[model samples]
Structure formats: C-alpha cells, structure tokens
Target chain A: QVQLQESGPGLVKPSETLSLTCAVSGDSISSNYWSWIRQPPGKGLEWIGRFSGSGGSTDFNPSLKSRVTISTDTSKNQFSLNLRSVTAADTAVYYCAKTYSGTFDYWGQGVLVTVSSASTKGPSVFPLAPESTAALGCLVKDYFPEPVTVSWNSGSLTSGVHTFPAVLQSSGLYSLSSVVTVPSSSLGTQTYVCNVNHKPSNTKVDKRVEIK
Target chain B: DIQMTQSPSSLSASVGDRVTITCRASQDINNYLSWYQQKPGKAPKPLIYYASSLETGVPSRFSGSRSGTDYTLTISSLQLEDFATYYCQQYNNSPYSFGQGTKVEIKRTVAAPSVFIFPPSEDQVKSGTVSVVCLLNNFYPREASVKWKVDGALKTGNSQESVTEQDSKDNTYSLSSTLTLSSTEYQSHKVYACEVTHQGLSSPVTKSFNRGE
Candidate 1:
C-alpha cells in the first residue's frame, strides 16, 4: 500500500529549470524504487529516470541524460526531479511511479506542465446554458491568462447582451458569464449559440441551445 | 525481456479430466509468472499470480507450480465453464511477454464417434507387408489416439496418423491411423486389435481383425 503525489509549478518559463517533487506516503522512501515518466500532448510515454534509495543507484534515459537529474531525500521521505533548459517540447504530463518487479506497478495522478514564455492556459467552455424565460446564459470556466471573450452567434446581435467580468477561483483559474435577453415566446422555435474564444491556447468552441 | 514458450497449443478434455499446460521462460524468472484465463470475447482474468499463489475468489481447482525455468498451470478437475484460452506472462523483466495461448476446448458429446478397422486387400497382402487402418468417424473433439495391440500385447512402430478433420456441421471430427505389419503376422491366426480412445469416452473402443474377418 503506497501513495504518491506530485507537486510543482504548473507553468515554467522557457530556458528555466523545471523542478518537481514527489511526496510519498504509506511507505518509506528507502524501501522501494521510484521512477519518472512523461508523455507529451498526443505523444507516447518517455522514460525520464529511475532511482533506488537502498543502493543510491540511478538510471536515466540516454536521450535526456545531459539535462535530467533524479535524486532522493531519505530524511524527508520524498524524491525530486530537475530538468534544465526547458522549452515547449518539454510540455508534458509528468508521472511519478513505483517500480516493482522491473516494471511500474503504482503511479501518481499525473500533473500537466506547460513550458511557455508567459503563464497561460486555454479556457474550458462548459456546455450548460442556464436558460430563463427572458435570458439565456453561458459559463466559460477554468481558464488561466484570463479574460476570455464570449459571443452569441458570431457576434451578430449587438444589444441586450451582458458579459460579466472574469472572476478568479480558489484554484487559480478564472470563470466568466455571458447572457443575452430573449423574448419568452421565442424559446419555442428560436436557437441561441454561445461561443468562447481564448487566445492563449488558440481554443474556440461553440454550443447551441434550443428550448422546446 | 524474458520470453515465454507454452506447449500443447490446443487440447480437448471432458468435465472431470485433469488438464495441465506448460510455460517455459527464456531465463530463470523466479516466481514472477502469472496465469490468465480468457474466454471468448472477454478480458483475461488472473487465476494465479507469483507462479503458485491463487488469486482471491479463484476456484481451488486452479493451481500453478514451477520447476526450473518452466511453469505449469493445472486444473485439477475441469468444469463445464473451464473451456477457454490460457496464457502465462513473465514479469521478471521489461517488455514482459505472454505465451501464445493454450486453448482448452470442451470435449463435445452431442455425437459419439464410430470406429472401424479395415484390413489390407489381396493385392496389398502380396507386397509382403500390409497396412491396417482404424478410422474414427464423427468425433466431437479432434483429439483421439489410436493404438494397435496384438493378442492383448502392445505393438509399436510403423504407424502413421492422419490429421483430425472436422465436418461442416456440429464441429464433429474424423481421423484415421494406419498401422503396418508383415503379411506373415497378418496370417499368423493371431488377433490384432485397433483401440481408439477419446477423452470424452468412458472406455476405449476396440475392434479386432483376423486373417479372414
């Protein structure tokens, strides 16, 4: 029985060192072998390195040997990774795992790291449109590098549309709301579309809402 | 990476028969072998782990053992639902490999096979050596063995068995084995018996052949 959790900065600036720590619980750090594996967006997994606390032995992938270092802190019951001179290519989901019987048997829920000059993440548009008899609303939530724009049907209608300011959430993401006034009778046959545009990740999404 | 080799690629057995399959590793794997059972169109279920430890809730009839680099998965007594494909995997190294499946098929009983023995004709007898053929017809499972016995004594050598063939319907099979003997032995007034044994049958079917009969 073991558990591993990874903690690090989500956004790392280019040319800076990326450092992450894996906290281990329910097991001692010197009792088992640990490894680091990462996968780029839409790419396969790449082995970063492996560390054995008992013998202080470390094995690293030759491809990244020049820039990667994995070390263990037996006193703190944790291990860490330091990869230097990162770029956009280093953006990946980093996973910490326990190696058993020459393979990974337990792993942590991975953390996504983005290497960019500016800290930014694209907004995730929610499909739910809170509809009222007089207004139809759309929510654009969980976006970093905030201030996303929400429009109705390619911005065709100009009046009676209200867009709320981006509000910061406790999780460090931002949420915004946009709504447009509509006649009650129009809900029977009319269709309203909500569109979200976030420039950081070049994401654009549209959701159409119709009430019958 | 360790590679696993399994024997008896396929077999047929009845409900109460004991079935054992073998998987050999390329190197000494200690106890890192696991056996899995896969039924038709379903994911594999782990029956044994660490070579001999049975998984929780698995039936006691399924067990495993290891000797040298070879591991065995044995079903002490097969059940009706035990007809499935089995595989052994080695986790001692990276790139763990699985054996190329051992399929245990049910010994079907909808139709029992009929046995017939045919002795050599006059022209074949003139050749100094004659061949006797034992044909098993419409057996459910394709695994049937034939033995030639002379006067209740076992006889070996000079025999060729045909491949088991399946009929277009019911998956029934047929096969024939030919045993050769000297013409003098055929005319010795001694009894030659063809014994056909199928796993599904409670007793072997035997047919005797004499010079004129």
Candidate 2:
C-alpha cells in the first residue's frame, strides 16, 4: 500500500505564501499518480493541481494557475506545492493523494491551514440573474464567518430592499438570505444593479442585468 | 459547454424506499462530477466529487458513478436526515453548472420558522452604535440558524440569544437573538438582514432593514 502524507503550518498570515510537502512512503513517488486536493470549511473540495507519472507531467485547476505551483524532488521521492499570495480563501484542509488518472485513489488525512486574513465569499444573486420586470423575487445567500449587504436592481427604484438578519450555523459561520421586490412597472427600464458589500473583506461586488 | 439534468424534479421517500438521483451531462464529462445535498433553509453540502470518492466526513451511504456522459449519485440507505434537494454539478469543463435540482422530500416534515427584524435603542442609533434584533417563531427543537452583520462585516462581538420558549398558548415556539453594535458609525439607508432557517422551508425566511427605518 502506498502512503502520502501532508505536513504544513496550521496558520498563515494574509498576503503570504503557503508551502506544503507530501512525504511519500511505502512506495515510490516517481510512478503512478500524485496530486493535491483541498476543501474550505463546510465547502466543496477542490483539485488544486496534480503531477503525472511521466517524470514531469503536470496540470492545474486553471482558476489557480497564476498562483499555484506543483513540483517534485526525485532526491526526496516527494512532491510539494507552493501557493503564493494566499488570502483567507486559501484557508482549507489540504490533502496529498495518489491519483489513478485524475481521480484520487489514496488520500492523506489532510492538513488544516488557515490564512489569518478574515475574508468572506461574496453573496450570489439567484435566478442566474434578475428578471427586469417580473413579480417574482431573487435570493441572495451565504455570508461566511461574516456578512454582506444583499440588494437588487432596476432603473426606476427598489421598494422593498430588505436585508435579512444573518443566521449563525452549526459550522461556526454566519449565513444570510434576502430579497428586494421590484414592481412590474420598474421592469420596463431594462436595467438593474445589485451590490453586495462584503465588510470584513472590504470588498463590494456589483451585478447588473438589462432586460430586453 | 455541457449541461447536466437531474430527474424527478422532486421526490418523497420513506425510510424503506431505495434511492438514486441521475444526472446526464450534455457531453462526455468523463468522471468530473460532484454531488451536493442542499437541505431546506441550509446551504448545499458536497456529497461526493466523483465516482467512489466521497467528500471527507460525508455519509458512507452516498456514492457517485459515471457511465459515458451520465453521472449518478446514490444513497445506499436513506438516513432520516437525508430529506432535501440533491444537485449534480459538472466540473469537467471551465464553466461548471448544476442540474435543475431534484427536490428530496421527506416522508414527513417539521414546522417552518418565521423570521422578524427588531430595532435597536434610539440612543444607540444616535451614538454611532445600534443593536439589531432577530425574532423567530413557529418552529421547534431550538437548534435554529442565526447570525449578525454590519455592511457585510461579521464575527467581532458575541451575539446574545434567548432560548426557544414554548408558547403555552400554542404548541409552537419562539426565540430571539440580539446583536449589539457599539460606537461604530451612522447610516440611514444601509440596511441589515435577519434570516431564519426552518427545516420545513426550502430557504431561510429573510427580512432586511435600515436602523433608522
């Protein structure tokens, strides 16, 4: 049975880089498959990057291509990942694994790492977008470890731009949802803007939809 | 680009019913598929990322499989808490999207929670500080989901909440959470939100408001 273990720091400062090394044992790391997988708390797992058995074959999740690097050391018979410019988003339980064609077959228990920076994922407006002039309302959900301002749009005006109170969940994080009902009359303008101000992260994101 | 479609749009199964939700992608997604279980009033949880690879600490009953471009999420034995919608998302491509979502209804259900947003003290409002109140009613068990936020900022102060008290007048229960904001700032139009999670609901009941309003 092959074994791969991940060892790294439990905490990292924001704007810093994280380096984790996979200690390979019970088998050689130069063959078969090897990769890194991670999961944010109460979130989905992500395949950060991977290395094939062909000595130097490598690939990565395009989203992290700019900041993630995967490399191996034949001398140590192990591999390492250096993720630079890591923020709170990079905080997650990372695991080293042996993959048989991209899917993991063996996994390390996982090493938990947290970037001290307190950032939250922005709120996403539902309906894949807003309906310019419909009686139905959209949903704004998920403010983690914090909260965000959830709103709606239209060129005319927003009547019931109500923000709901955040709810703390079992996961030690905050959850929120809200809606702003726009009347059918306002829909004719064919334009609306929704803004979410993620406080702790000090970021404001805006989404706009024009109805034709 | 690929599209994944889930069947039965909705389902109601008892403890005895066999379960499996199928998601067919528009093209050969290979094995890059993930399954998510989203309960009413709660966020979605990833069940499995691909065929046979369950998310860490997930239920063993959950499994994934792929045949050609069609992916499947199966539950070996439905647990009591398995009641909720299930979704299949394809990550084989750049733009990942979810199926229409298969609503997993429980053979039975719980009462839904009602939500309300209360105001802070007038003095607190004038002093660049304010308190937000969240009132929940018509629910059960007291394990409700609740929290606080100021312009999307959170996790600084401790939130105080009352226990869910049973209303003798009615079998239902009610609870309140108070979030105290101090010497912070003033905003007449920046509103906060109150979200209540009830097992009986597909989504949290929410209400937003400005402190001044």
Candidate 3:
C-alpha cells in the first residue's frame, strides 16, 4: 500500500559521480533493501546495486560494479545511488527502487542524466573503395547514430572510411554496409578487419575478411 | 542476481474466460512480488504487487499470488483489448530483475462482434483548426466506452469499426480507439485522456496522454 518516488539532478559531468535518491511513502522502510537501476535511452533495464537496512550490500554488473555504490537511511526512509568515472556512456535514466527478495517490483518515474559536456566528434572513416569482383563487402554496423571513423590499411594508398548516421532497424540491432578495397599487389591473398566503436558500451566488434 | 524465466511466453483467451501468467525466480525472493502490463509504443504499467494487493486505480479482476518462487497473475474473465504483454518483477533482494513478458492474443473461433465510441469528434479553431476523434468498441456481457477528452473537455468524432481478430494459438480479442488532432490544437490543448469501461472489472481504465508538439 506504500508508494515510492525518486528525485535527482538531470545532468552530470564526466569523471564525476552521479548521485540519486528514492523517497518511500505510506510504508515502513525497515527490513527491506533499497536499490538503484538504470536504462540507457532505449536499452533494457540494468540493475546498479542495493543496500540492506541490516548493513548488507551488493554491487554486481561487472561492467559498472566498481563505479557504483548503493546506500540507505532508515530514519528518513530513503536510499541513494552513486556512479563514478562516468563518460558519455553513462548518460541514461537512473531509477530508484526497492527489492524485497531479488525482483524489482516498484520503480520511480526515472531521472535522465547525461555525463560529460564534451561533444562527441563523429567517426573519422569515409569513401571506402568497392571490394574486388570475387570479394564481398564488409557488413559494418554501428549502434551509435553519430558519424564514425573507418579506414582500410591496404599496404599503400589507404582508402578513407565513409561515415553516416545509423538507425536501429530492431531492438538492439543495427545495419550498415562498408567496402574495403584490396590493393592489386595484395589481391586474393590479404586479410582485413572492420571495427566499430559505440559510445555507451564503448564496445568494439571486429569481423575478418579475406580477399578472394 | 537470480535468473528469472517465464513459461508459455504467450496465451490466448476470449472475453469472460480465465487467463494466467507464470514466472519463476532463480532463487527464493520472499514476498517481493509485482506485475506490469505493456502495450506497444507505451511504458509498462504496474498492475499487482506485494503478492496479491492491486495497485491504485487498477481493475478488480486482475489478481496475483505466489507459491514459493513461482508467481502468477490471473485475469478472471477476460475482456476485449486485454491483449498485450505482461511481465513480472521481483523486489526482495539486490540487483532487481524482470521476467520475460507474456503476450496475450484474442482467441479465434469465438463470436465476431463490433464496438463503437460516442461523441464522434471535437474540433476547436484558434490560430488554426484542431480536430479530435473518439472511438468505442463492444465487449461481451457489456460495452466499454472509449472516449477522448481534450484539455478536460470531451471531444466528439466519428468512430471506425474494426473486427476483432484472434490468434489461433490464444483466445483473446482486441479493439482499438484512435484519436487524431491537428498539431496546433494538440499543442495548445496539451492534455488528453482515453478511457474504457466494462462490467465485472473493478473500474474503468483511463490513460492520460500529453502532446509535446
């Protein structure tokens, strides 16, 4: 029968800790664990950590555990979240919640905060040449919508990479095409890798190609 | 963190029939129970919590129960437009998680019926003309009113009739009410509400919408 709510600032700077708090109303805050969760603009929800009123605590999520901490206040019936070393990837909707066992049954309206004031320059690759007659173009996809830097080291006359705003065709899925030209000297005998970097995950995925 | 899995990821039911969803947690999460329903293009709406208590303003027919780590959400006597995805979330421990959603579809082989909305459309002219539409659809045992109100005023508009289609796998029916307004009118009006009423359920389901335009 208790209702919960969340409040926090809407922005944060890079390398600074993002703090959030959850207020509990209509119910006793004792014997329950307070927690924090977040979701990137359109991504699935991820748990940050939790604080048990009894002094127990846990912060998993290998990707963010080290940078996150969850704490609670029994007298005021409130909890808070802190994330350190944040970059643009930390921009997301942070939610304050409670977990009686392990599930997140109650959640706050969510507060969206962005990390870093630095504008992310687009990727630097462009104008890749077509693959050879017997070769296939590299199927390069970038989850980040901004421009990206792409390049092909073909021994000599390095072909520049082209950049474009990528759109998500499905949940967490992206599609884009890039061509890496093969030099005449290395045709049919060289190998190549297409790499893409996304900000939030700052993740890079590489695919190898062989000239036919 | 415990891994949660839900069975029968989907189900089918008709109006006046019983439907259930099941969720299992990887570990025991004592008494930390919750349920949510999500329709396409909308955020998840809380339904049940604390094992059996219903959320404020939610219908009475929707109830929940738990036996150990196994939890269930049951809809007693389904109704048209109850077709959507339902999810379960546990809150007893750290690192909260959710169960995979269960999608409910209309059961075919049932009676084919049409529902209607009243007040048709509402139009207001200021800097530009603004038009708003309201729609209604019929359900078994009773009819639910689907209306659109603009800036607290009820709008009148024409209703389009669409047949209820059921997926062979599940027996659930669906009806939709769509309201369209000019961008200028929508911005000035700002606030809108869509409501539906039916019998056997606790109360009407009224959803609020706001225009960012």
Candidate 4:
C-alpha cells in the first residue's frame, strides 16, 4: 500500500504565496503523475493540476493556470504545489493527490492557512489590592488554535482562569466567551487586556479593556 | 473530443439471454473505440478496444461493433456473474472520452460451445498440423461461436461446431479447435484469422496472426 504525508505552514499573510509538499512512500516515482487539489473551508473540491514525473512537466487548472505550479522530485519521492498572489479567498485546506485515468483516486489530509492583518494593540495593566481574587476572561472566534491570556500589571491579586462555553452556528464560523472577577474595589476602572497567541509562529493579538 | 452515451442505464436478465447497449459518439471517431466493465466500487476493466480486440482474459460473450458513429457492446448470453455497467471510450483524440455505460443481466439458456482463435504471430506448420488451439470454458450454449479463416479467407469446413453435453461442468461449457494447414499451403498464406462469433450478433469477434516462422 502507498501512503502520503503533507507538510506546510498553517497560516499566511494576505497577498503572499502558499507552498506545500507531499511526500510519497511505498511507490516508485518514475511511472505516475502527481497532482494538487484544494477544497475551500467548506466547499466542493477543485483540481489544481498534475506533474508528469518522467519529464518534470506540468498541467494546471485553467482557472488557476497562471498562479499554480505542480512539480515533482523523483530523487526525494516527493511533489510540491505553489500558489501565488493569494488572499483570504484562497484560505482553504490544500491537498496533494495521485492521478489515475484522469481522476484522483487517492488524496492527502489537508492543511489550512489563512491570511490576516497583524494586530498592533498593546497589553493592558491593572493595579489590584493584595489578598484580592482576580478573575480573567476574553472572547475570540473565526480562527483556529484558540487565543488566550488575561493578566493584571500590578501583580497584587490572586487570579484564576475561567471560560464561558460557546456554540457553533454555520458557515465555518465560531463564537466564544470568557469571564473573570476580582474584589469589587480592586477591579475599579483598572486596565486589562486579552491576548491571543497562535502557534507555528507565535503570532500574538492583543485587545485592551478597562473595568468600570 | 467525442462524447459517448449508453442508454437504458441498466438492465436485468437471466444467465443465458443476450443483452446489448448502444454507444453514440458526438462525432465521427473512425472506429477508435473501446469498452469497459465496472462493478460497483471497483475500477473499470477494459473489455474491448479498437472496435473488436478483446483484452486478455475477457470472456467471449463480451463483444463490440461500430456502425457509423454509433457503437454497441453486446453480451451474447449473459452469465450469472456478468452483471455490471459497461462503458465505451473513444481514443481518436487527445483527452479521450468515455460513454456513460449499460448494465448486463443474465438469464437461463442451454446449448453446445466452442472456442476460436486468431494468432498474433506468423508461424507456418505442415498440412493437417494443429496451428493453434484456444481453450473455451464456463460459457453457455448457443451464445458463442468459434471461426477459423485462412489467409483472411473465412474457412467453411469445421467453421461451426456444437458442444457435447459432457464437455460442460456445473452449467458451464468448454471446447477447443485447431487449424490444420499443409506446409505448402501455409507458405502461401500470410495471415490466418480465428474469430469467435457471439450468438444473435452479426459481427464476429476475431484475432489475426501472421504465418511467418
């Protein structure tokens, strides 16, 4: 039996390129054509194109013809796919596949990446009295790898993590909620910030809030 | 690219009745044709190509023919295991195309059987010599025919033979035949054809081989 493993970044900045590699095992690369395909977050699949291993040649989907290149590396038992000038619309799980008789009969697990603008907000600091219990909470949605972190700058209060449950609606979107509490006086008009960190790059997003 | 379409989408029949489906090409393909059989989830198996050449291991009951732009895949006598979708593909241009496909259903029948051959090589043998013998097995009666033609000339004697009841086992029949030619006669002959004719069909399934040693 043959197997395929896909590896690539899980996130991208808008208008940048998306690149992925598919490594094949248990099969000789000399005789077959390798192809690339993509499925939007929750949409039908699309055929990208294929590469003939023998000649290092390619055929791309006419719609994406100018922006896609599918190539093979016989020596490494792997194939690669590249897409240029990508935007949020290109945010989808891209897959690599083997073509048989003009159709894809085998596929690879997909990897997803999204293009987003970087956040510039700074962390908020709040002063709390000693021996006071501080609660922290925040809300985030739409992106994978949930974000976390709520803290006080004064460092005079004891704090714990608390989460408010969420429910999914539809269309590949999500909503989440969180809450935190501290001594009434200690929470008066203090500044607090919600910070989110995404993995593989540790890209952080921060939003500040003030207590009344 | 020519689009091929099969009609009646599917059918059901007993183990010995004839079944046929029509494949119409969008344009003239000049006989660059092929047929395939695909069972439920398995990949399709090529049955015929170039109009009538049966791929190795294909049963004699499966045959094809072309009349202008329209082609047909006929199962002379359906068998218990012949139920499947049949598709026709055109190979005359880049980006080959295939027909939708038809299903074969088998019904009961009884008759004698025989096997025919057309050699792919040119080898000469003396008169009364056994040129080539094709083995036929598990086929139903009155559904198949074996033909021998010398140098492209259809042979008359022994052209059609009946199967003996003893030649079959468990409702399946089998038979074999040889072409006998004299050395002098074989030398003048450049090619010989062994054609298997399916019952209730006009075109004979055939193979041709050269007589060169």
DockQ of 1: 0.02
Task: Identify the superior model by DockQ, candidate 1 or candidate 2.
Answer: 2
Candidate 1: stretches off by over 4 Å: A121-138, A145-212, B1-213
**Candidate 1 lDDT, tens digit per residue, B67-126?**
888899999998877877787877676545578788777665666666666555565577
Candidate 4 structure quality by residue, lDDT tens digits, A38-84: 65643434557777766666777667889887667778998888888
lDDT of each: 0.72, 0.63, 0.57, 0.57
Task: Place model 4 in a CAPRI quality band.
Answer: incorrect
Candidate 3, B126: how far from true, in Å? Answer: 25
Ranking by TM-score: 2, 3, 1, 4
Model 3: DockQ score: 0.06
Better of 1 and 3 by DockQ: 3
Q: What is the TM-score of each predicted model, taking all chains together? A: 0.38, 0.45, 0.42, 0.36
Residue A202 C-alpha lDDT in model 4: 51
True-structure RMSD for candidate 4: 34.5
Residue B185 in candidate 1, Cα distance off native in Å? 99
Query: What tens digits encode model 1's per-residue C-alpha lDDT throughout A1-212?
Result: 68888888777899999999999988887866888877675343566888887788887777788999988888888999999999989998788878654445567777778787755778754332212335555656568754467888889865555555555555567666555656677777777889889766678989775532
Which whole-number lDDT from 0 to 100 does residue B12 have in model 2?
62
lDDT per residue (tens digit) for residues A49-143 in model 3 = 77666656555666687888777777898777778888978887777665565545566677667665543332322111121222223333324
Q: Can you give the lDDT of residue B43 in candidate 2?
A: 41
